[PDB]
């Protein structure tokens, strides 16, 4: 339907995350336990946030690189809806995580941060993967890498292959028009919501502009 | 120089990890906080293990994919000696982690689990990475991927490029002779030590075989 709004909780502690959820939990559709929070607090972050917000989709942004069955199971036992597996994981890592996701009626997203190939994209599809995260790396961003037409072309191509596409990577309100006409599953905002002078206005403006555009 | 021995603590909780370290802390060179323990407990696992064993090298196997400076700094502020960065991460992720590692007199390894290229390997060298982890994925292993000749050639080639190479991925004692003749920096064992009937004896066996094969 409309692209969903996901907030990324890239916080080092639960209390710092709650400074954000206490403002905007009900202003978004998906609550992400960011990688920073996974590492900071471990999978307790997942269990706690779902207990708080059981009606929201909770994503554990673990960026699983190996041990797909074990790491996926930990996140799902903690009541995750969705987990991420990093694009360079062995194909059997993605398969494994996907098998466990199915036991729990959750799902796996392949996280397209850094280097990957079109052949691997095909492999994910054959394995049954239905979601990808098209992601301008935070560190690439800080080195001056901008969003551009090659990203739009790549997102359209992933969409045509059958994936539901999330878009993320230092997204600002003003960025949303670049993706107009594409059936984007989710837009993620971390900093542009958490660090805004008004996190509630920031999230409502993302939701408004999405409604305008789609 | 003998390859060193690293134990991987791929435990879901600290107490499970301690059931291993109380036995083998003194039998190995590097204590790894496994990716599974980092995700199970968070970076506290790093801080606590270092506090128990401050004389040992502690490796935080975070497999950082992005946000190099932030994630590295969390690990290093928890008193990690080494952190890992996954090989597909944007080159600025590695660079970012390395800069932080240098503030703490630490170091970064690139984790070669999954796909990568030789030009990328050169980029790592130019950025100043000195260590790589040649890793047969646990899940590749489970699907029947064996160690083989192609792995020898790649390892030697990494070493010739100037990297200290760590080898890992379901290693059993019988696999060590595959690598004889190559200046391997570290072998990692997780399951083969932790799940042995006697972890102590398992670690000692690895050390004996290493000392015979590289002596
Ligand atoms: O909008 P951002 O601050 O970039 O956060 C969203 C992004 O997807 C992060 O959670 C992330 O995973 N960075 O790697
Ligand atoms: O010997 P193993 O049980 O395979 O554990 C070592 C390995 O390096 C793990 O710690 C790991 O990182 N797997 O991805
Ligand atoms: Mg994230
Ligand atoms: Mg490990």
UniProtKB/Swiss-Prot annotation, chain B:
Binding site for substrate: 10, 191
Record SUPFAM superfamilies: Ribulose-phoshate binding barrel
Annotated TM spans: none
Amino-acid positions noted as binding Mg(2+) in the UniProt annotation, renumbered to this chain: 32, 61
GO terms assigned for molecular function: 3-dehydro-L-gulonate-6-phosphate decarboxylase activity; magnesium ion binding; orotidine-5'-phosphate decarboxylase activity
Pathway: Cofactor degradation; L-ascorbate degradation; D-xylulose 5-phosphate from L-ascorbate: step 2/4
Catalytic activity, reaction form: 3-dehydro-L-gulonate 6-phosphate + H(+) = L-xylulose 5-phosphate + CO2
Positions of the record's site feature: Transition state stabilizer: 63, 66
Induction details: Induced by L-ascorbate. Repressed by UlaR.
Outcome when changing residue 135 to A: 5% of wild-type activity
A GO biological process held by the record: L-ascorbic acid catabolic process
Co-factor: note: Binds 1 Mg(2+) ion per subunit.
E.C. number: 4.1.1.85
Entry-linked InterPro entries: 3-keto-L-gulonate6Pdecase_UlaD (IPR023942), Aldolase_TIM (IPR013785), HPS/KGPDC (IPR041710), OMPdeCOase_dom (IPR001754), RibuloseP-bd_barrel (IPR011060)
Record has Isomerase as a keyword: no
Keyword hit for Transit peptide: no
Record keywords, A-Z: Carbohydrate metabolism, Decarboxylase, Lyase, Magnesium, Metal-binding
Self-association and partners: Homodimer.
Family classification: Belongs to the HPS/KGPDC family. KGPDC subfamily.
Task of the protein: Catalyzes the decarboxylation of 3-keto-L-gulonate-6-P into L-xylulose-5-P. Is involved in the anaerobic L-ascorbate utilization.
Protein name: 3-keto-L-gulonate-6-phosphate decarboxylase UlaD
């Amino acid at each position: 339907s409309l692209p969903m709004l996901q907030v990324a909780l890239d916080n080092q502690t639960m209390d710092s995350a709650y400074e954000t959820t206490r403002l905007i939990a009900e202003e978004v559709d998906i609550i992400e336990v960011g990688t920073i929070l996974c590492v900071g607090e471990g999978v307790r972050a997942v269990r706690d946030l779902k207990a708080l917000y059981p009606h929201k989709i909770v994503l554990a942004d673990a960026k699983i690189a190996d041990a797909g069955k074990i790491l996926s199971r930990m996140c799902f036992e903690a009541n995750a809806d969705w987990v991420t597996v990093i694009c360079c994981a062995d194909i059997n890592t993605a398969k494994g995580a996907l098998d466990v996701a199915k036991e729990f009626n959750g799902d796996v997203q392949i996280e397209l941060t850094g280097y990957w190939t079109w052949e691997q994209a095909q492999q994910w599809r054959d394995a049954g993967i239905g979601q990808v995260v098209y992601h301008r790396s935070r560190d690439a961003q800080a080195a001056g890498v901008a969003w551009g037409e090659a990203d739009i072309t790549a997102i359209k191509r992933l969409s045509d292959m059958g994936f539901k596409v999330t878009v993320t990577g230092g997204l600002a309100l003003e960025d949303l028009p670049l993706f107009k006409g594409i059936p984007i599953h989710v837009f993620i905002a971390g900093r542009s919501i958490r660090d805004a002078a008004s996190p509630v206005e920031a999230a409502r403006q993302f939701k408004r502009s999405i409604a305008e555009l789609w």
